[PDB]
Amino acid sequence: VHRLHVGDAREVLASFPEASVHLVVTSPPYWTLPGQLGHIEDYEAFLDELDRVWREVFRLLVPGGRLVIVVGDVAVARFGRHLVFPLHADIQVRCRKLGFDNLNPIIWHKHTNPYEPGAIIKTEIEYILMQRKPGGYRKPTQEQREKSRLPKEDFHRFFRQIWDDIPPFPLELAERLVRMFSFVGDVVLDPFAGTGTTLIAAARWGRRALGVELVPRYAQLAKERFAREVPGFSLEVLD
Template sequence: MFKWRATSELPDSRRDDVLSRLVSQVDDPQRAFPRMAKDSIFMALVAELLTEIQTKQTLYRGDSTDPEWAERLGEVHLVVTSPPYFNLKTYPNRDGQLGQVSEFDEFLQKLVSVWRSCFDALVPGGRMAVVVGDVCLSRRRHGRHLVLPLHAAIQEQCRRIGFENLSPIFWHKISNQQTESQRRGSYLGKPYEPNGIIKNDVEYILLQRKPGGYRQPALEERVLSLIAKDRHDDWFRQIWVNLNGASTVDHPAPYPVALAERLIKMFSFVGDTVLDPFLGSGSTLVAATSSGRNGIGIEVEPHYIQMSCSRLAAVDAEVEVHL
């Protein structure tokens, strides 16, 4: 059985009893699970039990591009992360400047060591979800519009490491870019004339898999990891349009907790361990807590470590910090 939260008003025996009754309804998972996923009452009980599971969220202050941190992790079942946005760097503002391409290449090289460490930490068959946008260089700052295909570079890096590339998800995330004439719109350039530039309103959720066989989790874990039919139909499609971005007040490039929660529930089981090597403001571990998963986060900036701890305290998470 699972370890339950000590803060709950329900006794452990009561929660064990509810779980046992849910599991007892499964005679044949292949037939029972589709029926259960359509049962709103059953799925409401599953959702309630998820919030009762005691998890552990571990934060490390460190540089995830350093291969040595991987030795401290142990085994993880899923990686959910979003690397820093390269185009948040400040470039010289001069005509014809496309940005320091050599710096972009160095940025990519640093990412390789992170993906390799994630590969080593993942269990066979484990997944990695990387939320990333391409690097858009504007004409105003760099002399011309240009897109550096960061998503494609990461996919190729992962393939060379040994990951299996899976179909990505396209997240239609409305940006705050404007046209060159300072009007909001779907393009960049002169209004109503040819050769405008289509705005970058899409982020990629790259899905990678470490080779290996399918896992055989316990029946209790499978039951509590069920996804309701309406959510399953909405989530397991390649284009996501109904998910808003997160506020950038406290962090320049956060992703919403709802996004991390989707990915965690889609690609892991209750009780699994989720890793985020670029923790930032802590969205992944907040989502892991509400999803009944353990989490490990690595973050180099002390301010974001403190912010993550505050957010986790707000959801009554058990937190362990290594500074």
């Protein structure tokens, strides 16, 4: 049963049983801002709220489970002084505190492209962070393994540090992560469901979708979007 719960991710995840989730693929909610350190204070207050969700994720994740976070660093130019908040970096260092093992991230190259020194380089990438729960991975059955095997060409395209062939993140981006880090039958959660990209990706490949979304309006849009992308199946929404 593909589920999507409406409510605060921190509260909802709190009502789920430990080690019942195999994979988390998600994108942290949008964060936007006279003023000295007032900005970084709100910034670190944001991180404090994300940490609460990551902490719950570390609980409901099975050992060997993984938390995948797709994040771009928040830039702010004309304090008109150009400044970039290193979100991906902060999230990485903070997850170590929650007990996650950090793995190499995959660089999502989203945007491909007075000539004097000092020019600002435009943002072209988002980071796909990988945080693993240690302890000793579970073992999928022979059938699960066989049905989750990736064709050679897809394997070599997916498992590389930089993805430059995928211009809310795209379904194809989510389908890759679901296929790379879970097996058919596994539960794939997204604490910040949005329009349900991850749920659609998970459901589409024989995994069980489990999501949480704050705004009830978006929850409904996802169910409809879900019913279109997942022919025959439906997205159960509750509060």
